[PDB]
């Protein structure tokens, strides 16, 4: 049948320092540019788009990540790096050594993200060859979304400033985290926001009137656990739109268009290629999964 193997030639013998970090991460996922057996080291890193002196733009880096093929390491010999390949759709072992550690189980779902917490921890530099190698981060799909949710909010509220506890902290059950923003190029993260101004004001035009009248009946006295956003007071805008009388066949045409544009919001909140894990071992930290196509 099909083989999958990439062995990487390298022009200098690696030091014992940098080999100890590579021996630590023997099971890891890093993307690379071309589909061949032999390969130069300048394609193995994710740092062809994310270098130090270049200001990184994590949306464009994540935009970069869906293009490339993904690969898993097998051995780290002191001359040649040896990797295995991931093709849709193939079952394969994957092992998480990833440093901001989360816990998985059987029947979980994953995604691949650029490093958004600690670049210095998740990237090792190679002083022997002069080229650095950048590792992406694998995240379950709930936090896979919820970090991108915060980074889109952040570029909204850095432009208005032309403080940090509300904008830079990704929330999760049990833990809070710090996003890495010191030097970010907003221009590729703002074109996504440029399309968000397109979808969101169209959705403000076709608003169902009955579903506005539902909140005027709800949030004044009927208090629920998931309506604490409004804090018990109606917004001033919602009283203005509900002056019209209700009729069913107006909203039937509206709610289908409300339905059809939420089909489009998949395309702007996309992750990378997804990973549907069926079996995960706990104490071994190995797993098994099939790589999804883009």
């Amino acid at each position: 049948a099909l083989d999958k193997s990439i062995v990487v030639n390298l022009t200098s013998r690696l030091f014992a320092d940098e080999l100890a970090a590579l021996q630590s991460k023997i099971g890891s996922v890093l993307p690379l540019g071309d589909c061949h057996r032999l390969q130069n080291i300048q394609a193995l890193g994710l740092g062809c788009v994310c270098s130090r002196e270049t200001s990184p733009d994590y949306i464009q880096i994540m935009q970069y990540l869906s293009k490339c093929t993904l690969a898993v390491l097998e051995e780290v010999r002191p001359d040649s790096l040896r990797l295995t390949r991931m093709d849709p759709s193939d079952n394969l072992q994957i092992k998480n050594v990833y440093a901001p550690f989360f816990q998985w189980d059987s029947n979980t779902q994953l995604a691949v993200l650029p490093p958004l917490f600690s670049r210095k921890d998740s990237t090792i530099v190679l002083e022997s060859n002069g080229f650095d190698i950048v590792f992406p981060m694998v995240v379950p799909q709930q936090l896979g979304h919820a970090i991108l949710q915060q980074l889109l909010v952040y570029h909204i509220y850095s432009k208005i400033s032309a403080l940090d506890l509300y904008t830079t902290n990704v929330s999760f059950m049990g833990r809070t985290y710090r996003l890495d923003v010191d030097n970010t190029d907003p221009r590729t993260a703002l074109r996504v926001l440029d399309d968000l101004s397109m979808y969101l004001c169209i959705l403000s035009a076709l608003v169902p009137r009955g579903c506005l009248r539902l909140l005027t009946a709800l949030v004044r006295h009927d208090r629920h656990p998931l309506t604490e956003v409004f804090e018990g007071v109606v917004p001033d805008e919602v009283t203005r739109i509900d002056l019209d009388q209700l009729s069913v066949p107006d909203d039937i045409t509206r709610m289908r268009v409300m339905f059809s544009y939420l089909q489009s919001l998949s395309s702007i909140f996309n992750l990378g290629p997804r990973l549907h894990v069926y079996a995960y071992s706990a104490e071994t930290l190995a797993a098994s999964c099939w790589y999804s196509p883009r």
Binding site: N9, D34, H36, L38, Q39, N40
Partner: protein, 49 residues
């Protein structure tokens, strides 16, 4: 040649080259005297002919 750098490999390559024949034409005239032709085919019957 198989390389160790890695740029892309090179598949098998062939070429099919067309050739053709150039033709030529050649001519050179031969004049004959009409007086010389006229005396050829008749029979000689005298010591002068």
């Amino acid at each position: 040649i198989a390389h160790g750098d890695g740029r892309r490999p090179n598949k098998q390559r062939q070429y099919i080259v067309m050739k053709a024949c150039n033709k030529h034409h050649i001519g050179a005239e031969i004049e004959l005297a009409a007086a010389d032709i006229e005396l050829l085919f008749a029979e000689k019957e005298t010591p002068l002919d």
